[PDB]
């Protein structure tokens, strides 16, 4: 697809047998999600936002249905108010900004 | 343009006589800028980013050339590390998400 960027770009993933929205980020070299049990083992990270930083539990190796695209990569998970989707997933669904 | 996301999509600017990088920024809704002189009137706004708030000063029609596009908008001016191209001026410029 294309998107205009007219409104936030939302798009739904699934993540965990669980089915979430998460905004399509160009500006995070991350993907951080708010506060949900994902199984498996786990390393603590900081992450700084404008405002300051969140502490986030690191997950590598995790499966992601992000628009019917199947990736794997790490996630953080923590205290963000939105769903974030990184440049690190970004690559892997092959997105591009075009002007 | 096309710009893939494997590096951040930083791209030179021109705003109020001076030459800046910014980051393509599709999760955030405005444009944030570090601390600069911009000439003219400005309102107090608070922006949240992940991490917390910062103050910010509100210029409005605002001349900035982003990639040889001219753009009129809306910048906040303030203590952010990166300066942020937001969705106000990326529509301007008739960016898309692609995949
Ligand atoms: C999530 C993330 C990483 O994993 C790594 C590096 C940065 C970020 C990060 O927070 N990036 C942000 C830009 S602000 C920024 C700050 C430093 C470097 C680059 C960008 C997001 O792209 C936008 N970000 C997305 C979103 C993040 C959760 C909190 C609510 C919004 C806030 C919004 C935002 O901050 N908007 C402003 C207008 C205040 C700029």
């Known amino acids: 697809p294309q998107i205009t960027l007219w409104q936030r770009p939302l798009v739904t993933i699934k993540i965990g047998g669980q089915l979430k929205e998460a905004l399509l980020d160009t500006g995070a070299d991350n993907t951080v999600l708010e506060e949900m049990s994902l199984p498996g083992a786990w390393k603590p990270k900081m992450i700084g936002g404008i405002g300051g930083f969140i502490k986030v539990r690191q997950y590598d190796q995790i499966l992601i249905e992000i628009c019917g695209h199947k990736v794997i990569g790490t996630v953080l ?11 690190n997933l970004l690559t892997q669904i092959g997105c591009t900004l075009n002007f």
Chains 1, 2 share one sequence.
């Open 77 to 87: 998970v923590g205290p963000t108010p939105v769903n974030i989707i990184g440049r």
